[PDB]
């Protein structure tokens, strides 16, 4: 049944709750972003109001064929009324179209639902600075102190420098980048920009990217693989067998593959710096795992929460085991005693 951490008290609303059938008492279903564990259940047969960003609404119409009459896109950073309740959508710094949602309950309670997010100090100057938040529904994906990772900027500088050096040393090398969802577009777009190429990809992935309102996108991507020297493949294909196979397909145009797997966290992060990352190599194929995250590190999460000073935290991730729930509750209490709220 629908878990309590997907329901907004004092309203008829749910958040990211499309896989439970008709949730009794729900008058409006919000969707924070277009990732499959969150939209699971939606299709052209859905007949209740969906509230989302404009980009998420484009993906629902074009990829899932949800009918237009049930898609209710909202602008960001704008007070809107939904079924009698004031709401605001804020940029979550996750994937394209991802939002956090502020609910202003009739009784005076204010609720923030982060959806999935990567906390940032810029959020401390949004509409969140303007009133107190009582309850926080928090993306706790990486809520443990082992989870450190570099800035997105540091990771893209490493990728651009590695790719540019490899292709200038060997003009017959191909660059491949893995993907299985929206998000992390800066990785393949920044590498193609430094090389003077478009990114080549499948018709399905090209359609997805054309839903994202990314400026000048027609200048950056293509379905013509032959003209491109940065290719996107399914993340599953980013291994030695899948890559050797791909290289056969290119008909002797290339003699070397340099591949990137933008993972979340990997336990080389506890030891190794970004400067010190090395690939796995077999023959003329090399694979780099790069720690490009679209979720908060531990420290980023902690700063946001100590700034916000909520009265109550409701975790939305890692909630399925008693040891994970107890560990997170211990960190929340540490943060509150340290900061004095």
Residues that bind Ni ion (CB under 5 A): 35, 116
Breaks (C-N over 2.5 A) in the chain follow: none
Give least dist CB 98 to Ni ion, A. Answer: 7
Contacts of residue 248, defined as CB under 8 A and 6 or more positions apart, other chains included, come to none
| Residue number with CB closer to Ni ion (36 or 69) | 36
| Residue number with CB closer to Ni ion (64 or 129) | 64
Give least dist CB 241 to Ni ion, A. Answer: 29
| Residue number with CB closer to Ni ion (197 or 293) | 293
Instruction: Tell me the CA distances in angstroms from 227 to 190, 238, 263, 275, one per residue in order.
Output: 18, 21, 28, 32
Give least dist CB 20 to Ni ion, A. Answer: 19
Give least dist CB 177 to Ni ion, A. Answer: 19
Give the C-alpha separation, 130 to 290, whole Å. Answer: 37
Instruction: Tell me the CA distances in angstroms from 241 to 177, 231, 236, one per residue in order.
Output: 15, 16, 11
Give least dist CB 21 to Ni ion, A. Answer: 23
| Residue number with CB closer to Ni ion (117 or 254) | 117
**Beta-bridge partners for 82:** 85
263-298 burial, b for 16+ CB within 10 Å, e for fewer? Answer: bebeeebeeeebeeeeeeeeeebbbbbbbbbbbbbb
The DSSP 8-state label assigned to residue 217 in this structure reads G
Instruction: Tell me the CA distances in angstroms from 289 to 183, 259, 275, one per residue in order.
Output: 16, 9, 13
| Residue number with CB closer to Ni ion (13 or 34) | 34
Give least dist CB 282 to Ni ion, A. Answer: 32
| Residue number with CB closer to Ni ion (35 or 118) | 35
Give least dist CB 117 to Ni ion, A. Answer: 9
| Residue number with CB closer to Ni ion (41 or 106) | 41
Token readout for 282 is: 């077999």
Backbone angles phi, psi at 334, to 5 degrees: -55, -55
Contacts of residue 41, defined as CB under 8 A and 6 or more positions apart, other chains included, come to 18, 19, 20
């Amino acid at each position: 049944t629908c878990p309590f951490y997907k329901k907004i008290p004092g309203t008829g609303f749910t958040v990211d709750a499309f896989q439970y059938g008709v949730v009794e008492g729900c008058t409006a279903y919000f969707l924070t972003h277009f990732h499959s564990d969150h939209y699971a259940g939606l299709s052209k047969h859905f007949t209740f109001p969906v509230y989302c960003s404009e980009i998420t609404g484009n993906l629902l119409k074009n990829k899932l064929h949800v009918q237009e009459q049930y898609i209710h896109p909202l602008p960001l950073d704008t007070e809107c009324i939904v079924n009698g309740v004031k709401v605001v959508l804020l940029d979550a710094n996750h994937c394209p179209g991802a939002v956090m949602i502020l609910f202003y309950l009739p009784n005076g309670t204010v609720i923030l639902h982060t959806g999935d997010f990567r906390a940032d100090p810029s959020m401390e100057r949004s509409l969140l600075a303007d009133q107190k938040v009582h309850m926080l529904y928090l993306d706790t994906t990486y809520c443990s102190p082992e989870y450190t990772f570099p800035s997105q900027q540091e990771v893209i500088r490493f990728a651009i420098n590695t790719a540019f050096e490899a292709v200038t040393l060997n003009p017959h090398a191909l660059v491949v980048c893995g993907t299985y969802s929206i998000g992390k577009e800066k990785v393949f777009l920044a590498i193609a920009d430094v090389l003077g190429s478009k990114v080549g990809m499948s018709q399905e992935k090209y359609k997805t990217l054309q839903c994202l309102n990314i400026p000048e996108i027609n200048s950056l991507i293509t379905t013509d693989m032959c003209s491109s020297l940065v290719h996107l493949l399914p993340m599953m294909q980013i291994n030695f067998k899948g890559l050797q196979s791909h290289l056969k397909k290119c008909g002797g145009k290339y003699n070397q593959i340099l591949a990137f797997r933008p993972t979340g966290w990997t336990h080389s992060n506890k030891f190794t710096r970004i400067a010190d990352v090395i690939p796995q190599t077999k023959g003329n194929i090399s694979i780099y795992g790069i720690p490009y995250s679209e979720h908060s590190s531990y420290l980023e999460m902690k700063r946001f929460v100590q700034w916000l000073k909520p009265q109550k935290i409701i975790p939305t991730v890692n909630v399925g085991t008693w040891k994970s729930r107890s560990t997170m509750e211990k960190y929340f209490r540490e943060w509150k005693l340290e900061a004095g709220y």
